[PDB]
Design a protein around this ligand. Structure first.
Ligand SMILES: Cc1cccc2c(-c3cn[nH]c3)c(C(=O)O)[nH]c12
Ligand SMILES: Cc1cccc2c(-c3cn[nH]c3)c(C(=O)O)[nH]c12
Ligand SMILES: Cc1cccc2c(-c3cn[nH]c3)c(C(=O)O)[nH]c12
Ligand SMILES: Cc1cccc2c(-c3cn[nH]c3)c(C(=O)O)[nH]c12
Ligand SMILES: Cc1cccc2c(-c3cn[nH]c3)c(C(=O)O)[nH]c12
Ligand SMILES: Cc1cccc2c(-c3cn[nH]c3)c(C(=O)O)[nH]c12
Ligand SMILES: [Cl-]
Lengths: 208, 208
């Protein structure tokens, strides 16, 4: 596409996009153009408004475009074109990506006792309500645990809420602990999209 | 009053105030209370909306209060109170003051020729369209010119636009230049509400 400002908008929160260069109050010669999941190619929005788009996006007295509640379908490109009283044309170009922060991740069904030298199911971590999906990762004493490595196996699962489209992630961690290691290791789970959300650590005990 | 967050809102621009602690989507147990120039003491706004207030301020799906175009009469106090799913009450308290930036100040009717030793009309400076009024100040070589001093006299005039309520300021500067000084001094005028807006300097000639 063209040079744009990248906007990240939270699902459910309002979004205001400025039409740069426009008159501060009506009358204004401006046009908004948007191409999102709600549109078949470009849709033109006028200051006069009207029609179904009035429940979704309206042009404000100052010429900004306002979306009361951003949803998944508003991902896309939003463009404004305006004229001054002087006569200069100004263009504004936005790449809108939407997001939702899931709830705090949770470790469920954790093991109390690992046996060094064999593979062990450590636990299952669950994140609910993210958009885009994101990923779950595991940590040992603060160091990141890399899958397909030192007897570390991770399996993951993504599910979509049938109506909101928000993702629920489930991650299963299996380790083979090393004979002669920390007999009380600390495992955590973190969600990464924005900062990271970490779980409460689990501290199982190992046969050495 | 009580402890509040101070909000400065530009006349003509939208304003969104977050109702902290509220659920991100309906159903929500929340109330907005506002006391501004549009109200006789407190006015309560509900998520259901309705009535004349729908042309002025509405409660968004996330419980924020939205004002499409702030005006002078929206100065005052905006309060929210909410219950989350856990059950805690959260309060949000805002003191909203509105403002407008005037256009660039201009020197009109400047003198090209001053005579040192007598009082001289240097010029007249004009600012249009501020809220609150603000004040005009004069500068000599970049250093601020203080009234009631070395033959420095300033007279000022404030006018109100009969429909928008915005202020137009007019300032007249009179100096008594000093014999033996800069024979080509530089005078500017600045508006102070936020940064300061300065005029193009005027450079008269002084007969020492
Ligand atoms: C009456 C009226 C005024 C303004 C826009 C629309 C649209 C529409 C155009 N693209 N997306 C929606 C429709 C429809 O979709 O039928 N009707 C409208
Ligand atoms: C109750 C309520 C609260 C907040 C916004 C709206 C809008 C609306 C404003 N801009 N875009 C949509 C409409 C509508 O007129 O459909 N109703 C609303
Ligand atoms: C590259 C670019 C950046 C920002 C705005 C535009 C517009 C445009 C938006 N409304 N009206 C026109 C157009 C075009 O449609 O030509 N191109 C643009
Ligand atoms: C201040 C004031 C003057 C006149 C009417 C109303 C209404 C109203 C509600 N439903 N129909 C009208 C409300 C409100 O309940 O928000 N406030 C008002
Ligand atoms: C009652 C009423 C009549 C006509 C327009 C609006 C708007 C509005 C239009 N563009 N932007 C905002 C709002 C609001 O969303 O507050 N209410 C309105
Ligand atoms: C001090 C203070 C800060 C923030 C909100 C409130 C509210 C209140 C707002 N809507 N509903 C109640 C009240 C009250 O009116 O009890 N006091 C408050
Ligand atoms: Cl007046």
């Amino acid at each position: 596409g063209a040079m744009a400002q990248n906007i990240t908008a939270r699902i459910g929160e309002p979004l205001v996009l400025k039409c740069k260069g426009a008159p501060k109050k009506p009358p204004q010669r401006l046009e908004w153009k948007l191409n999102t999941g709600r549109t078949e190619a470009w849709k033109v929005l006028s200051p006069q408004g009207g029609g179904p788009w009035d429940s979704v996006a309206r042009v404000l007295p100052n010429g900004s475009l306002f979306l009361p509640a951003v949803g998944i379908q508003d991902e896309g490109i939003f463009r404004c074109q305006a004229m001054n009283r002087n006569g200069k044309e100004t263009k504004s170009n936005y790449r809108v990506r939407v997001y939702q922060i899931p709830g705090k991740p949770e470790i469920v069904d954790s093991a109390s006792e690992l046996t060094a030298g064999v593979p062990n199911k450590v636990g299952t971590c669950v994140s609910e309500g993210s958009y885009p999906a994101g990923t779950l990762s595991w940590h040992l004493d603060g160091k990141p645990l890399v899958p397909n490595e030192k007897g570390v196996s991770v399996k993951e699962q993504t599910r979509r809420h049938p109506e909101t489209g928000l993702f629920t992630l489930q991650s299963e961690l299996m380790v083979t602990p090393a004979r002669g290691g920390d007999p009380r290791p600390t495992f955590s789970c973190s969600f990464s999209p924005h900062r990271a959300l970490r779980t409460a650590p689990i501290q199982p005990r190992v046969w050495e």
